[PDB]
Symmetry: D2
């Protein structure tokens, strides 16, 4: 076919999709025609989305959340690891706890979901693991020794998973957004490093996720898709 390939309704799970960027991702994938499930830490999801409670720092809860999703919409085919936190501080001011808590949620939590999803993904010969990284992973925003390390670790993990599982139809990619609006960052002068001279919207991030979850990205593995308006350009 010359046009867009035929659409396939995928079983989607968006971790941390109860608000913010994760909510816009989940609603975009639902409007695309997918079967979208989201996770929350207890407060619940909006009415328009199927929600399950899950803390990505608890391996038993991650396995428990996948069980509900498999029972509701089938085994997860597209994982969007979006849950994450930030604990910024100067290097000498950053404690061990504020470092490990960012690592455990942003890095290790994304591994727990990708490992739990890889079971059915290998047997069904299909899988889309989409980590939500950040420009800070390769650009290195100051006062983010923990956040920049976790977001950069997503690139290494996604590429180690891709080099193993791409032959079995399972790819792992990373969406790296810049400053996204969901104002103090603008007051501190963040616009000076963004060539687009504006912040991105959550819907623009969801547009990149919708691409990686569609039938137009089956030959894309280990990629870092920057949604930063040119902020993270470099090496």
């Amino acid at each position: 076919t010359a046009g867009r390939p035929a659409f396939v309704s995928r079983s989607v799970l968006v971790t941390g999709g109860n608000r913010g960027i994760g909510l816009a991702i989940a609603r975009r994938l639902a409007a695309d025609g997918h079967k979208v499930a989201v996770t929350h830490r207890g407060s619940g999801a909006p009415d328009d989305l199927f929600g399950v409670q899950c803390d990505v720092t608890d391996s038993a809860a991650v396995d428990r959340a996948f069980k509900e999703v498999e029972e509701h919409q089938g085994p997860v085919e597209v994982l969007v690891a979006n849950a994450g936190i930030s604990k910024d501080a100067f290097l000498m001011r950053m404690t061990e706890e504020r470092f490990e808590e960012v690592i455990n949620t942003n890095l290790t939590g994304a591994f727990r979901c990708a490992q739990r999803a890889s079971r059915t993904m290998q047997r069904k010969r299909f899988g889309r693991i989409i980590f939500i990284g950040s420009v800070s992973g390769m650009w290195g925003i100051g006062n983010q020794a923990n956040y920049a390390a976790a977001k950069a670790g997503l690139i290494g993990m996604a590429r180690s998973i891709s080099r193993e599982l791409a032959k079995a139809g399972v790819t792992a990619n990373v969406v790296a957004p810049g400053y996204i609006d969901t104002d103090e960052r603008i007051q501190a002068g963040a616009l000076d490093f963004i060539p687009a001279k504006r912040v991105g919207t959550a819907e623009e991030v969801a547009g990149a996720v919708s691409f990686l979850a569609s039938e137009d990205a089956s030959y894309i593995a280990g990629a870092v898709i920057p949604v930063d308006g040119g902020m993270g350009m470099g090496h």
Copy 2:
């Protein structure tokens, strides 16, 4: 806002859209709903698309092509610099001519089209400059001193253009494909027979439609905040630093 944004039919120009990857890009963008024009060198436009004869090594011809496209479908809003060639040789065997003609077509030829389009793109506060690079730009396929230099140069040019014009709604990005199947017959791919699959984690070559899928995303409304990016369509082949 929640779903896919409202579609805008863009004036599209695809260099080298008569065969290969460029033909798939032109057909995909037309099926998306864009006003698609292609450049050729005598064969003419495919399907019902609009065609202009243009060799990207001739600035006078590039200006002439943009003038005819402007009259037919309005000024070019989305440029897909797809025209390219290859002249492989060992470093000690590569001549000055075979190095420069690859540079003049793949790198300079992309500049001629990108420079010619920038004027109206800055007027209308919109512009999508999509370069068709290669995995060899950053991965460095052997015997490609000229080809890898031209494809890597597309990244630097796209990022210099983006840092200057992204504030005016004009962005430049690069699609870097890996080994893509462009065979017209059932014959075996000679690159595959040479062991190309040993470097592709996907263990298969890509299709021209998959590259066109990546170009369709960059030309759509879902990529307005993407500038200076390299989109690898290589099955994980070019992973590294």
Copy 3:
């Protein structure tokens, strides 16, 4: 001025410098003229170098290790975070425990030393934080979801540290070795590297010739990790 800059003896700490690549780095920096200390886990440092007992998974041991180094040879000016482990497994067979202990040693362990070192480096306006990464960080060696994440995480941490502290003379860089003798189909050099070659790149990042280098990934891999 035109030649090599005048040498300055720095206080060096090399984590895990009792054997392997860390030992070759310590001997190289000692031969350069640095005051070289190394951390061990009870095996004892070679009688040629100053040794402190430290497990990089323990913040209290890290704080005590730097404390003993400051009293002996002055506060650490050049930190070489070399201590690291590997626990490979297929993604479907890698456990949470196997993932976290690789992260805790390679990534979090390197942060504990860098965070402790920045206490005195930032005040004296000189600092060289040199992380020993791996080609797998950006190349993504298979069966290393934990290892590649930790090694790629060193890049983001070094660049975040650099953007904050480069203005104060404190820089952070990563040395990313390939396969080092202590697979050749992806190595253009068609051979493996040696520990002395890794130590040669560390010697450069710890010398007076690398004061303007920050957030850099220096690959010592024979070209294996070329890409993007």
Copy 4:
């Protein structure tokens, strides 16, 4: 295994554009290391402290004769430092074909001419160090540099295609990418200063030493962290 610095080996060095600027500092450093250093010039005359040959990197015949004169004076080139380069900045709308191609022919194609001319004897001798002088703008993309950034980014792709082909024969190709070197930009420089020519020459001395045999296709940024990104 030797624990200290490896025994120094004096190489035959050629530094293009080593008559002034960064190239002059690179050549004086490599000569101070112990190498036999020759530089290229374009009639102004090499400085009184270095052997000079006349060569315009846009002329393949002049490059061929330059390596001939270097070989007759100090042996065939073992370490090549492609330093010659120009910049013709302009906005994209204002950049002409002549202005674009002039920067490409000198910075990119001129680096290929020297790299091609030295490649054969490097392969036969099983040793070769091709060091291209790139720029932060290659991967960072400084504005008004559609020609300069394309040329400096092309040096990376060429060096990596050369390395993947010839690293097995002991011939590596690397790129030193300096930031702003003194020979409003401080906002993007985490070091909050500009570099010196001696700091770029220090990185070249490393890539030309016995401590960089296992480094191929690398980009060594000397920018104070300016080009950090992806």
